[PDB]
């Protein structure tokens, strides 16, 4: 979805 960097899962 989001184009941003995903953080800790």
């Amino acid at each position, epitope marked *: *979805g*989001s*184009p*941003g*960097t*995903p*953080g*800790s*899962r």
Partner: antibody
Amino acid sequence: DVQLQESGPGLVKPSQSLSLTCSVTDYSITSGYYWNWIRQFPGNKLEWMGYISYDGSNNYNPSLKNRISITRDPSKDQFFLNLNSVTTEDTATYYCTRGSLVWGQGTLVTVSA
Amino acid sequence: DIVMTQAAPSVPVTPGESVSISCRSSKSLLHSNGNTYLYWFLQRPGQSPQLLIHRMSNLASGVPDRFSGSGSGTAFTLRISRVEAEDVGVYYCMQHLEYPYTFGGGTRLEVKR
């Protein structure tokens, strides 16, 4: 705190393969984030090369054609840049990053005979 | 690819005054989620790039609130109020909407003395 450090040869011959390693400390590369390679040419232009994600999936810059692979070893918290068939156009300072926020110190690679 | 353009290669500023650095994109950076994916970086001499602003207007950590990001669609501004001598370096925009991520050419901030 999370830190990243590039390592590898600083001199590569034309037409050969460039390989660099990013060693990540104090964070598991499988836990999250995108893990990028970005390079800076002489003259200071920046180019995003690609990333490997927390699941080992990739995305690369089409500018690099089919020359680039980014791979990882979760057991060592390392990820790797491989760039085939280099020319003098690949002379640059190579940075590994965690997303846009955390940067390595960069490592210079010169392509020359 | 999305083309990023920074019209001014450099900008002079008197300390204590404000400056605006411009960036333009070839396509709107607005995502359906309502965020606009434009990031700003500063690179000081002999250092790695530092994130200043993410998602057009959000201030990254370790940056004085003298720094702000604004804009919309294809036109963006990094504004620095109350410029200090230590602000010297090169400011780069980067779009983070589509792959490949792409950078503007940079604008060097020069302090007048």
